[PDB]
A paper describes a structure:
We characterized various features of the Salmonella-derived YfdX protein, including the crystal structure that contains a novel fold, previously unknown stoichiometric features, proof of contribution to antibiotic response, and participation in the control of bacterial virulence. Moreover, we found that Salmonella YfdX plays a significant role in bacterial susceptibility to penicillin G and carbenicillin and is involved in the negative regulation of bacterial virulence in an insect larvae model. Collectively, these data indicate that the recombinant st_YfdX protein can form a dimer or tetramer in solution, and this process is affected by pH of the solution. No homologous protein was identified in this search except for kp_YfdX (Z-score 20.1): a number of proteins containing a helical bundle were listed including Nitrosomonas europaea small metal-binding protein (Z-score 9.9) and E. coli cytochrome b562 (Z-score 8.5), but their structures overlapped with the st_YfdX structure only partially, indicating that YfdX adopts a novel protein fold that has not been identified yet.
Even though such a zinc coordination was not shown in our crystal structure, we did not exclude such a possibility completely, and thus attempted crystallization of the st_YfdX protein sample equilibrated with the final buffer consisting of 20 mM Bis-Tris-HCl (pH 6.0), 200 mM NaCl, 1 mM DTT, and 1 mM ZnCl2. Two forms of crystals were obtained that were diffracted to high resolution: rectangular crystals diffracted to 1.5 Å (space group F222; crystal II) under the same crystallization condition as that of crystal I, and board-shaped crystals diffracted to 2.3 Å (space group P222; crystal III) under the crystallization condition at pH 5.0. The asymmetric units of crystals II and III contain one and eight st_YfdX molecules, respectively. We once again determined the structure of st_YfdX using these crystals. Nevertheless, oligomerization-contributing zinc coordination demonstrated in the kp_YfdX structure (right) was not found in all our crystal structures of st_YfdX (not shown), indicating that the zinc coordination is not necessary for formation of the tetramer of this protein. Although both the tetrameric (at pH 7.5/8.0) and dimeric form (at pH 5.5/6.0) were confirmed by SEC-MALS and SAXS, st_YfdX was found to be in the tetrameric form in all the three crystal structures, presumably because of the increased opportunity of contacts in the crystal lattice.
Residue numbers in the entry:
A (entry chain D), B (entry chain D): 16 to 187
C (entry chain A), D (entry chain A): 15 to 188
The structure:
Amino acid sequence: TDNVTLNNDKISGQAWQAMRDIGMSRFELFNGRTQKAEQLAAQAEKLLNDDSTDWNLYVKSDKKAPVEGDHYIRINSSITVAEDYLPAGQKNDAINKANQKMKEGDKKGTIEALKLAGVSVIENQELIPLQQTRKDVTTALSLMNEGKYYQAGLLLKSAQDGIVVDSQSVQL
Amino acid sequence: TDNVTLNNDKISGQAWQAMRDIGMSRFELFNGRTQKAEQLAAQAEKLLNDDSTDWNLYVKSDKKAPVEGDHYIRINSSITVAEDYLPAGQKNDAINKANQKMKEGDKKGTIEALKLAGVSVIENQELIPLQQTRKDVTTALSLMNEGKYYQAGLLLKSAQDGIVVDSQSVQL
Amino acid sequence: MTDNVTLNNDKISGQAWQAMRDIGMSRFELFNGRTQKAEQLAAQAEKLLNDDSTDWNLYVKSDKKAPVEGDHYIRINSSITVAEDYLPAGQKNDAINKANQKMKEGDKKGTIEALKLAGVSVIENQELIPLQQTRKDVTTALSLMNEGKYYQAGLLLKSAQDGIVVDSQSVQLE
Amino acid sequence: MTDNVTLNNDKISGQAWQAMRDIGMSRFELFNGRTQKAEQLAAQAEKLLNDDSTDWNLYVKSDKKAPVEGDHYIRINSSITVAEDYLPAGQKNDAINKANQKMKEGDKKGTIEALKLAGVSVIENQELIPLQQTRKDVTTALSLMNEGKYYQAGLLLKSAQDGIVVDSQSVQLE
């Protein structure tokens, strides 16, 4: 399933699951189960090339991908808080306000109430370069079809090293 | 589903999925969807306390958990290789031997052939303390039932910081 | 503690890098029962970070909004990630030789182009900290140590470290 | 570069820590078109790691099998992870005060017990490297730099860094 960032940008659940599959496929090479490795690599190839999927939904438009003509897409998002010192009594009142804002679904009000609590919020967006990752998966399957399993492991690993984490303060 | 380490120790797919749920639940707090946060926290509570599950299957017996009477369990495993220098021609022959061993399902022969290629293999086992994590999830749900959403976020984060990565050279 | 530069020649604060190292060591010594050593380490970080003979604008990454109003991210480290496409070895080894010559020549843009021909993409990982927010964490951590509130000081030092972010960007020199 | 100790008082190599820092910087300078500076950094790491006036046994973590036959993991850094159970604040703040006094007193075992009463578990993260395998990576990286094979040298420096492992263990002093 798809999730969303705080600014409501879509996150690809399929590409996330394909990154999980790629990592398992590499493990199964070393585990001596080469056919399960190929199946896992194939599932990631299908997840990443699904023509039903609208891949433009997940593109992070303001980040230049390594290869020309490629794009980064979002595959996960997580939260980092950083608390500054505040007297506990004034912080508690501020957090109470934040909690009511979360219950109200007010995202911007949540960030603002948290700011008054000395709390800042970073959003870490995990990204992959879609076409680079597709090419890594396809060449890896080609190497598996040649019996070059270690070399396929190298390509799968490369796809995983292509993941970046873009950490940005929250601006709504 | 369950996976296995190289020595064939079982890995808990449910606890893995509960760690993924915990992290999403914390995000949804900040995202201002407190009820989806509670549902995600509840799914992790059910995954982690399933009495159908044989939790002793996943225990890492030789690692002392923080809290007394608790145990670490395995929730993931991945591979790190470290290549030493070898002339390319003698390495290629060694990798050929390794690839045939992987095709043969011979794990120990794979590690040995890889050694002759200058390649060593580390297994990173991701672990969680089961009862500590259960308690974190339950208190977090209690705090959500009191409307203390930020404070529940703290407990969910603590569960995630409890994850350790045990990296060990492969011995079969 | 001496400065370095990114691939684009932007300055990197070695003082700020050393403060973050001291902050980590300071927190450890708290739990190690050496609070006096913990304070000297945090005091070292505070004076590294607040040096008013240093021109902190040299280190700012201006295209990144800091969490706290009026703050800025500064560069404290740069590292390299490569990603290798599969290539006919002869074609790759040939372009690697070219990229090696460009590195000898000090030709950064030639190095990136040659590595492209070798199927190699280069990412530059810039480690950043929010300057003023980090100074405030250290200063208040020091106050807490002087008040004997050692566990609480460790909380603020940890929070300073969690402010470190890594900006991974594909290399574009021209 | 000076040594420290773990919570259990086992020695930590500051020389090895500094070599790993130099190895990272050396790889960066390769791509930065400063190969001469890259070699000096790797040469610094090699002589830090191979110092035969240093007693490398002091740093060995004997309960951890290194990947290569006859090698050993050595400690290059220690850090702290805490995990806090939810506790009635009054009960927690009370035990934190006790833990703060134990840290002032330099009483490591008292600090751990007091923190337990506060719902706080302490993990010590020990960063390790395989000593001989790391020396070999650096030495051959230097050879590759002298042969003008700069990209290939970066491969070996990267491989040295990927040998770093973190042993996270709950704190047990008695």
